[model samples]
Target: GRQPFNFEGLDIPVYFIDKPYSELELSFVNDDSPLLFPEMDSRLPKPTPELDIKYYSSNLSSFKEDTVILMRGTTEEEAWNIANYKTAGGSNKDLEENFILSFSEYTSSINSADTASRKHFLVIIKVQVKYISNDNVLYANHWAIPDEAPVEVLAVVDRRFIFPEPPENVAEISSINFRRLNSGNINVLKGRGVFSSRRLREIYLRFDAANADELRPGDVYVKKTKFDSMGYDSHFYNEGIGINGAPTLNTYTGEYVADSSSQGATYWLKYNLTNETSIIKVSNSARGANGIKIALEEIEENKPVVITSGTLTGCTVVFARKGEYFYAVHTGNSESLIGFTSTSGVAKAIEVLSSLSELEVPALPDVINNNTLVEYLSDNFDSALISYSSSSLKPNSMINISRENVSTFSYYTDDIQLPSFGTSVTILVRTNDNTVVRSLSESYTMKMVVFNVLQKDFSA
Candidate 1:
């Protein structure tokens, strides 16, 4: 019934609901929110083309988990073409022009894990064949590997790929209606980890322009170098991550943004550095983002100095500009599945205060002359039986004495303490102070009511 929480190396702590069978409602409702991984959507094959791609699911029946989903590099093209041999026109021949990809064997490769533990993971492998030289141009021969070759072979491990993926002809993974792909219902097992929204861990990284939200502790963040690109320096904060076409942070003012992404902006560089010496990287052409480079530039924290940056070409091409504006090279843990959910709740008034104070009650003419009056004092508040009626004795004399007309206040008053809740029921309420208060953590139950008194009934 009671087990220790798995906290070792878990920067984002994990708590095992102890009562696993217990059903609980969370404050976040994501039905229409369509919790998606924006970062994950950007990297993948566009068309549902028969070119090269494959999907695999990890075997959970064996209780074994796959930390890596290997890809069959050059062979992917051969596999796709072989599978389509009947319908499409092409010789399933040696595809000998394959020396580039070597027309060789294929399989999966394991990068450092990019997610939390889940019951299952959908590993989608994308193979892009680029003819570097095929340079024997003389023969039908093709293929060569450039030190920093322009070819792209990627394998993405996301738990959400279980749904029907875009076919070879379809363009861009973003074009597909994934929300409809699952019919608007969020699957508990579809993300990095398996759990209802209540138990899921959330970590959001946003830039601080209005001085509102900043990066997390170890975020390898760089300020805006070319901050403005088509009036989007501000829109950058809109999607939490900027509005670049490639979903990157534009560390420079305008040196470069990405070319043609449906999003139509460039990729900016920033990372939740999961650990010391850890950092994020993007390919030269900005096609995709993969693992954090262990071989990252180790710069000490900002020396109160902000500096410019160099072109970001992953390697060889100088990336950072000598830590000028680098937000320091700190350590942190990275979560596989990033999520976002809004806070939802309905506050009910369980207590109302009296309009008449005790000091004002004894002075009422009704106390001496039998003046008629209405009272709601003793029934709820620390108030006395007093007049709430208006009677100016003539609109000029002393009878029309009325107070705030009894629009009673419900929360934030000293007298309103939380009443006894159900036996096993628990309620989490925030206190007048910013800290959250909860039921069963009863020591503070006798304190003032929960928050918000700027207005009686409010929106947002």
Candidate 2:
């Protein structure tokens, strides 16, 4: 159905379509070759090209077949040629410019007194200029336009927090263990009290040593300064003997190394820094104690005595010749678990500042290849002694014996026969790693018992 229509006056250069649907779409198909936006490669690329349109029809069924065209921000006559459909560089006026671009294609025949008088019609064309900046932000001056455009139009304001990258490789101190041995059997050690045998590269820090519990970032760390009757450093061993056993000083600490490999002996000093006040006061609690202040001094002499396959693996159990007490450092190739003698609370802080980041631990018990014995043997010698030999039903004969002495000690089992005693025989037994054997001598008792037996025979 065709109807007579007229546009009295339209301020903006735009067209209106009579589409009554809830939503409308205006599409433009390429006629010859697909045209690309030339401003796409510029610093601030122009938004995807689009057409601007308005709806004027009231009824959804009676829609009009109309086409609309949109021009650049400003349409001044000076830039009308550049802002035309064929030109890439469109008008870029700052504030105000005339709407000079043609709206619809100007035609004829349908523009007489009666719009339907002829087949071809000449309709007035109008277009509205819209400003689209980067990031798809739309701007329009519905009323009066401003003087100058914004210098920096915010395209995007991103809000996100990123986590820091983890270190490529980081090392940590590992476990610790302690062992005590009898002074007499120090060279022939056969058993250990607490620690295992695998870990050997750990170090034990004395009371004068710096500890991690006190040092974190920029804090000054100092050890206990006051000395006891024994005159031991307090900081390395937090709890020291007082006049009656009171703590004399306290302070947070820095990272210090007990360098055993140094030419000046295996002693403790501030690790990285030297020559200056090596021990900085990280905390106030460890203020003004004489012992800790002296911890900064250089060790008097050459390298700490390197123990070869020594009896004790931990600390130097060497005490002053006068005192029976021994000092030891508990360390190893394991995690540094601070260990202290449970009684007086004397302990060592071990830290490994090395490239070896991870320590190798042992396999669990069940999966371990080697078997360890965990049993004890008990026997009554006299009651079970016998002199006999049999093979099949008889045990082997006793080879060696004194002219008139007992030949052997035999056992009467259900079927298997056993060898006689008083002969050189090898007995097989399982080995136990955790076993401790007591070397109590029975020489005097044996002699007394033998004397009593001979005396009874002589009396009879």
Candidate 3:
């Protein structure tokens, strides 16, 4: 059924279907009224009797969908103590120093319509107590207000009362690990500590150059500054937030070589921006090759680039030359989730090639031939195109062979003849002009023979 109801300043229609044997109630059917004005402030406890409640209101509509109430007090103990307060009718409970209360426990509760359809609207009423000692020392106390009664009150303590005295404990150096450069400079340092006091302001570390295995260090050379402290500048992780740690850089220069046939060095930097996202930058410097060669591989294999028609047999071979380098930027949820970009897959290949070191392409191989009768059995005719090159072979030179023999035809050759029975097969090599005939520089021969023993002779 559909019903029209007045919400705030607007009249909207709401429709809902009744379930089996179910009834729907529309209390506002006879009341076409505007939203009630906010009476939450008036219902709150007045600032009388040495204590008052403060309210911190937030736009309910502006928060995220799953964001519930986030309440905190000066101390986790006080926050937990107040969150466990009972709001509904219950046994009369003694009031502690301070406690948190929800708006539902106020003298009057606001209606949903009063929020003007704002989804996330919230009004924070911070319940606090005023403590004035006989010495006239005024102490203000605040408490956290939770959405529900806590399952347990962990602990409670006086926030303003400093026990016998404020915690004062010595901070000791637990461990010190550092990396130094060849120039006697510290590249980085990792420090750990154990503090006796309840509070930690900062850490102080002193470093000095002393004799071998000296227990008592000498004059201080490097002193702790604000940057080396445990503050904003220092990289630390807060488990409350999603930050895991600081940015990390790893350089693999173990195989680095100068003007040699090797990759100069490979490096990567991984930055953790949040719990859900991370960025990685990787670079390879060319040492021997003109530049570094980079490629995306599903499987790691090394094979020559296929310039002719054939199945990819090994790793894709891509190289770069001269002042060359390869850089890749990627974002992923984790280190293993890194992804790659799509090229025409060709454009990426071209980029990889351009980043390679310069190459002095070797010359094509010279053909060799042994002048004996290069015989072939009827079944072995397919092997007649076999050729060997003593040196590097020219590209596309493998396509010039055709065979002619008794009862034989070319697979895809044009006007090429095959060797026939009782005829000498002369293999000819032609240059690019087709007008010049090239002969093999050396020679080798191969022949195959077959006998028809079945039915040709008496069954053996």
Candidate 4:
């Protein structure tokens, strides 16, 4: 056991040394380019010579190749054609549509044996005119003719083109024949603008399927200023939708809405300051007075108010505010158009009442662009204006009475100006003949009636 233990502790002699081998002793292989990678070939679609590439190009004239080629080649022959092709534009990639299809011999490498190709041909189109009559057929823009269809002409004006004012009750409406004012007014043929040669039928056509048999009056009118129309680049904007060089804003009723609920609503009826707008008229019938009263109720304090409520008597007087300016008010009927004109020559008027019948309602063109929500209330303007004539009247003073039947004295007076919180007035007019005639009179009771105005203030 002692000898074995000593042997276990003894170390065996071992030697290790580094040695150099002959050059021929070592050999290595480097697989850089595999035969399958570079040696493989693929079939690619060859680009046909003189192939017409149809692409959206404004430079290309109708039926003429004015645009340069979109793509070039990869292989030597393809590259030569792309580099040397006379039709090639500024650079191989300058044109937007340029593209090439390539097939690889190997997953990672391309070869000379592959082919390159260009695949599309397109054209640029500017649509101008399109027309659809009740017949459900589309015609050229030229079909638009005055006197044939209901023609509307809007004289565009804006803050830029302010007009001079006229005397009270008079509007400076020029005849449509005035060449100085109406020249350049576009005339639409079929469905095209005479100004821009572009076709509009295509532009509005795709959307036509969405709106058929839904056209309304004033559905075709444009009302914009000359200065504004010039900024727009579309031919449709230039040609007035169906006429060349005609601006659509002032030529056609460019705005419209078809919903029936918009009727009887108070609205911000827009007009051009540079051009003439139709008379700022309101309804003088029962509905008109009612509308004015509603307008007044909705007036935001400092702003003037209006309503289409009250009697339709020609002598039944109503003093109403115009727009936001309260000091500028009006009093009159059918024979007289009354409103306040600012020192700036802007006319603002509050409607005392509307002279519209159920039939007339459908005739007044629907306001499309600016839709208004008309509110109705039993205690509002649409109802009645009743009051004690004694408070605002003197003894035996004959009030301006509006009644179809002068037989007995039972009519309604809308002449009481009550406090904002209480004492409302109701008016009801009755006629024996019911001839649909409107009536108004100043001989009524109230005098020096103060319209309760809510004044509001704010700080910025």
lDDT of each: 0.18, 0.18, 0.17, 0.17
Off by over 4 Å in 1: 1-69, 72-326, 330-460
Model 2 gets an lDDT of: 0.18
- Stretches of candidate 4 off by over 4 Å are 1-298, 306-311, 314-460
Give the TM-score (vs. native) of candidate 3.
0.16
User: lDDT tens digits, residues 200-278, model 2?
Assistant: 1112212342322222332223333322211112222222121111122222111222222211211121121111111
What TM-score does structure 4 among the candidates reach? 0.16
Q: How do the predictions measure up, each by TM-score?
A: 0.16, 0.13, 0.16, 0.16
lDDT of 2 at 387: 17
lDDT comparison, 1 vs 2, better candidate: 1
lDDT: which candidate is best?
1
Task: Please estimate how well model 4 matches the true structure, expressed as its whole-model Cα lDDT.
Answer: 0.17
* Tens digits of per-residue lDDT for model 4, 1-460: 2321121221212111111111110111110111111232122212111122222222234533232211111222322222232112212332224332111110000111111110111111111112101121121111111111111111100111112221211112122212211221211111110011111110100000000001122221211212111122121122211112221111111111101111211111211111121111122211112122112222222111111122222212222222321111122222232211110001001221222110112222232100011111111122221221222222221333432212111122234433111111111111222111111221122312222221111101
Once fitted onto the true fold, the runs of candidate 3 whose alpha carbons sit more than 4 angstroms away are 1-84, 87-185, 188-332, 338-460
lDDT tens digits, residue span 1-460, model 1 = 5442222322211112111101111111111111112222334322221111111122223322222212221222322332233111113333434454332222221110112211122223322333122223211111222222122223222222222222231222212222211221112011111000001111111122111112322121223222221212222221222221221222211111112221211121111111111112111112111111111122222101111111211111111111111111111011111110000000000000101111122232223211121122222232111211112332211223333422221111234344411010011111232211111100112211212221111001
